[PDB]
Every structure is written in structure tokens, then in C-alpha cells.
Structure 1
Amino acid sequence: KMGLLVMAYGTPYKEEDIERYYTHIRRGRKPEPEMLQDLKDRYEAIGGISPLAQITEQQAHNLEQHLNEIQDEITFKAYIGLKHIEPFIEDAVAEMHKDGITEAVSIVLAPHFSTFSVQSYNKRAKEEAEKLGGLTITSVESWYDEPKFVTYWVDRVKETYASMPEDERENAMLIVSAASLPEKIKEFGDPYPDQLHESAKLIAEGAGVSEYAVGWQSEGNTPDPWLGPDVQDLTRDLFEQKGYQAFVYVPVGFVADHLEVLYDNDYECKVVTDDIGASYYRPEMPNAKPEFIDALATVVLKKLGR
């Protein structure tokens, strides 16, 4: 019986939880009334918060079921650990420990390694396990290069391009993005930026797309600079330089239909394309599709040498 610790940033399960989620992200400070209202507005804008938290649940559940289905050596038990939403990462480890689990494999629902989004989760998780004792966690650190994951996006892209009208297919620009982070991660030699660039190349060459670019999105609002250029500005600058008739957005850094994709892409990036008279394209996110789950299953099994 092995533990399967699945971690992610987290999304509120109920609208009544939006505020605390914000506080947690703001590290103890409740958001300003307007600031809070502006987040609530965005969730409504995309159809409600309700569906979002369910996707992460289905991903972990399906991953557990598939891993236990494709091989008979190990029986996995999934535990969700989130950064800003209960069950928190430390709560999930505590529960694995309480349940008697002595060995566990963890994986973050973000393909690129970064200090802020993968290393900090693994660290928090392992430190809690050590404090409890008798629980050893083996952590997946990056999987953006897993061929089945790359293939997933390559196929979604080939399809989008093959469904475009003639004019666009010859004047389209592919934008591969991930969640931006403070530039100070460089102080730690964080390869996050490099992994994104490689992720973009792998997908572009796989789909046979030659015109593509790398951008960042969803940066937080702090006094420090964040990884740029932002997808919105990148789209404008690229249009100004070649007048592309279409932009295809691949938020490879994200795995589900969350706020960053449904809003920051489907709304804010479409605002830019609409403004410049270009079509907007954004292939389906992995969510809990079997093709994606099989990719994660292979990633976990490989980490275990199986």
C-alpha cells in the first residue's frame, strides 16, 4: 500500500471560501473589499467557481484508479495536498501517516519545476513527514518532458492548426505559456524559465509549427518584478511585428480549466486578439482526460523504476 500525494496550488471548493483563499495567498492579510470583489467577479465571469475544484479531485482519483489498474505490484492510495486550500499539504501528509502509510510518491500538478511551485511543496511535504516519522516521500520534480504529455499537446495543436482556414494557417503564431513567478527565483538558479522554453520547443517541433513564442501569465501583484513578457503584451508586440491573423495559446504550465486559463486566456487574451482583428485559439486543457492520466501514471511509475 503506497501513498500517492498529489499536490496543486488549489482553488476554492465553494464561493464562500474565496476570501480565506485570498487571505492565505496574501499570507495572513484579508484582501481589500474591492480587491476581494474583483476576484469574485472573475470567477463569476467564467461561469462560477463550483466546477474548478472538482477537476483536481478527478485527476487525483482517476490517477489512483489507473495506476492500480495498469499494474498489480503496487496498490496506490491518493491524497490531495493543496498549497492555499484545505486539505493543505501538511494535512495530507498527516493523514497518510495516521493511515499507516510508510512509503509515498508525490507529484505536483504543474509539469515544470520551479522553486516556488514544486520544490516548496515537496519541501513542506517531506518536512512534515520527517516530523511525524516513519514516512518516506519520493518526489517527482518535473515531467514536462514525458513523451505522453508532450504528445497530448502536440496532437491538440496539430488539430487546431489543421482546422484553421488557409489565410490563418500561414499567418498564425503559437504562444506557449506557464504561470509567471517573481524574477528573484533566479537567485536560486531556478530552471523554471528554461523548462518552459524546452516545453515550448518540444511541442512546436512535434506539431510541426515553426512560428511560436514563449510567454508568461497570471503574475501576482507585488512590489517585485515577475517573469515577463506577459501573454497579453507578447501578443501585441508579435502582431505589430508580423500582423499574424491568428494566435493559438497553449498554457502548457496549467493542467485544468481553472481561472488562469478560462479568464487570463479565454478573456484577456481574446480581448487582445479581438482588438487586433486576429482569431483566438486555445486547445483543450488536460483536465482529467484518460490520455493525460495515463501520462501522469507513466511519470509516477518511472520515478519508482517501474
Structure 2
Amino acid sequence: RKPKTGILMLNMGGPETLGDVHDFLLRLFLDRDLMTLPIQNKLAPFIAKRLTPKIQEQYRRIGGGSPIKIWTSKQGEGMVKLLDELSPNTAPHKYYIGFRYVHPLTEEAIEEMERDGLERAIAFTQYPQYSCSTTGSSLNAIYRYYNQVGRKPTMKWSTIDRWPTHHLLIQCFADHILKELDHFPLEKRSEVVILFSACSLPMSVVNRGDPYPQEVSATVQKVMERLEYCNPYRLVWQSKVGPMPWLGPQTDESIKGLCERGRKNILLVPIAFTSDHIETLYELDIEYSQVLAKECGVENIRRAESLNGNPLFSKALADLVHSHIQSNELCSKQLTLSCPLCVNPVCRETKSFFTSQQL
């Protein structure tokens, strides 16, 4: 009955209600692994307070809050149900949600995992493609937690730090793309252009050696091969913010560019997310698909459904955990290599934390 193997599902997280926005932002601007700012401890709360109204407004526009926790919970529960049958030797399994910037925080989840007296602890990132700003930050949080609490872990840790091409992940994306293509008018099906849209990164980050771009590209290639290249495509990036240079082409500019060039039937695909969030429900669905799309004269613009509750996805999660357990992997080979230009000293410490785990 008592849990033996815990699977900590890592994700940035998102505010559940408009009221959670302020703290979400605050924790986010306080994260050194994400950004360094002068008098950060004083500025952060300030920047959070001023951005709060604008961000709360974005969440109001999609219903009043993020569904991330609901979808994560459902995927986790489905995963556990399967794991108990897949790996009896490591059962019972229990999933824990460790959101980086909102409750339940990564730290709270770890505290709970230790209290449950687990034997196994698997840091399972929910970002298929690795970025030092996403998965890396979550992994650093785990290392820092123990380093700050001043005491070693009581469970054997390991991580599934990336999985950009897991065959079931690719199948889920391909299936969702195909069913969405079936939603376009029959006459336009073959004319549709697929825009794979992933979260962009500042060029300063890309230039230090971030693995993200290459991995996202890998996922896209895998999805397209499974679709047998039925339609032309392009990998574009969204969510750029600020005056600094980010990796492009931007998704909004691409949509606008495509229309002005006669390609008015577009299928957007959130290729770097496993569930819905503000980036898909607001940026892609409203900002680009409703507003921008109208101003540009698009004929048809649709978005592949996010993986969310697809039973195949829960199966994907379970297979990954199962394979990870059977291989005795502590982490991917890729995690043993820090960015060539990494300037964050905790990265090497975090890497060692997982590569040095007992058993």
C-alpha cells in the first residue's frame, strides 16, 4: 500500500486562478537560473506587481486560469495506473507534481516524497526537449533543495531529463495533426501548411549552447516522417518578449508572411508542449488565430489539439518511466555535458548530483 517509487513530474506550472498570478511572476523573476537582474530581490517583486494586471487579463481571456495542473494530474494518474501493471517489482508507484513557479512547488513535492519514505525517486521532466531554462532549472531546484536543507536525500534519485523523439510522443502528435487536418475543408487539405510552433529563446541563451533548438527540430522531423511529409512545414518560434534578439522566425510574423504570399490555410502545432497553457489557449488560439489571422485575411487556421488527456500519452509516460527503470539509467548521456559556454556554477553541481547517485 505505502508508495515505493515516486515520479516527480516537473513543469514550469501556471497560475490556477487570477489571484495566483502575482506570486507566479514573483517566483519567476527571483530565479537566477532564468535571469540575473540588479537588486533582483527588490526589483522582482516590483516587476511582478506591474506585470500582474496584464497577465491576469490574459488568463481571464482564456477562462480565468491555467489548466496545467488538471491535465498533469490526469496524465500522472493514468501513468501510475499503467506503471503498477508494467513494473510490479517497483510498485506501488505514486506521482507528485513539482511546479517550478506555483504550488505545488518542486520543494514541497520533494518534502512530501521524503515523508512518504520512497525507495525510488525519478525526476521526470514534462518538457520533451531539454532547455537549461526549463528542465535544467527544475533539476537545479532539486539539487538546491537538498543543498539548502542541509542533508542528503533518503531516496535513490535519477532523472528522465529529455525525450524529444519517444515513438509514442511522436505518434500522439501525428494523430492529433491528422485529425485536425480532417477538420479543414476537403478542398484545402492538400494546400495546408503546417507551422510547428515552439517557445522561442533569447539568442544569448541559444548562443551559449542550449540543446533546445536541436531537440525541438528532432521532434518535428520525427512527426513529419510519420506523416510521410503529407504537407509542407516550417518550424517557427513564439512568445518572444522584449527588445533583445530571439531565435526566429517568429510564429506571428510567419503567419502574416504566409498570408501575404498566398498560403492562407495554416495548421498550427504546439510541438514543445504536452498540454494546454497560456501559450496555446491564448497566444496561438486568440492572439494569432483570432486577431492576427483576421487582420491578415486567412482562409482557415486551426491548431492541433494538445496531447492533454490522450490515453496514448499516458502510455508514453509509463513506457518512458518503465524503460528508465529497467535500464538503470541515472540520466541521459546528454546531461553529462554542460553547455560549452555555461556560466552557471550550479549546472555542474546538478549534473553531478544525478550522475553520482547510489545504486
CA contact (8 A) 1:180 1:226 kept: yes
Deviates more, 1:56-65 or 1:171-180: 56-65
Paired with 1:117 and 1:13, the residues of 2 have a C-alpha distance of: 19
More divergent stretch after superposition (155-164 vs 258-267): 155-164
TM-score (norm 2): 0.78
1:264 aligns with 2:280: no
Residue type at the aligned position of 2:213: P
- Please give the alpha-carbon distance, in whole angstroms, between the structure 1 residues aligned to 2:85 and 2:7: 14
State the partner residue of 2:88: 72
The question of 1:11 aligning with 2:31 is answered no
User: Given that residues 270 and 304 in structure 2 are in contact (C-alpha distance below 8 angstroms), is that contact kept between their aligned partners in structure 1?
Assistant: no
Structure 1 residues 200-215: aligned runs within 5 Å? 200-208=220-228, 209-215=230-236
TM superposition shift of 1:26: 2.3
Query: Does residue 1:106 correspond to 2:123, yes or no?
Result: yes
Compared CA separation, residues 224 and 109, structure 1 to 2 (3 A): same
Seen in structure 2, the aligned counterparts of structure 1 residues 203 and 24 have a Cα distance that, compared at 3 Å, is same
Residue 25 of structure 2 contacts residue 48 of structure 2 at CA under 8 Å; is this kept in 1? no
Give 1:89's match in structure 2, choosing from 106, 109, 125.
106
Q: CA deviation at 1:297?
A: 0.8
The alignment partner of 2:133 has SS state of helix
Q: Is the 8 A contact 2:206 2:247 kept in 1?
A: no
Distance in 1 (CA, whole Å) between partners of 2:293 and 2:106 is: 38
Cα 1:5–1:237 change in 2 (3 A) is same
State the shift of 1:212 in Å.
Answer: 0.3
2:169 maps to 1:153: no
Q: Deviations along 1:21-61, whole A, 9 cap, x unmatched?
A: 12222223244666321111111111221644322222223
TM-superposed deviation, 1:193: 0.5
What letter corresponds to residue 65 of structure 2 in structure 1?
A: I
Question: Relative to structure 2, which stretch is displaced further, 15-24 or 3-12?
Answer: 15-24
2:77 maps to 61
Q: State how far apart, in whole Å, the 2-side matches of 1:82 and 1:68 are.
A: 24
Q: Is the 8 A contact 1:129 1:137 kept in 2?
A: no
Choose from 240, 253, 259 the match for 2:272. 253
- Aligned amino acid, residue 145 of structure 2: E
Shift of 1:122: 1.6
Deviation sequence 1:222-247 (CA, Å, 0-9, x none): 46432222211111223333x11311
CA distance in 1, matches of 2:64, 2:252: 24
Tell me the residue number matched to 1:44.
Answer: 60
TM-score normalised by the chain length of structure 1? 0.91
Q: CA deviation at 1:152?
A: 0.8
Secondary structure class of the residue paired with 1:116: coil
Q: Cα RMSD between the aligned structures?
A: 2.1
- Structure 1: 5+ residue stretches without partners: none
Equivalent residue letter for 2:314: I
Of 207, 210, 213, the match for 1:190 = 210
Matched, 1:132 2:151: yes
Alignment pair present for 1:238 and 2:258: yes
Partners of 2:59 and 2:65 within 8 A in 1:
yes
Query: Which moved further from structure 2: 74-83 or 97-106?
Result: 97-106
Q: How many residues align?
A: 304
Q: Is the 8 A contact 2:258 2:264 kept in 1?
A: no
Contact 1:7 1:106 in 2 (8 A): yes
Q: Which amino acid aligns with 2:310?
A: K
Q: Percent identity?
A: 26
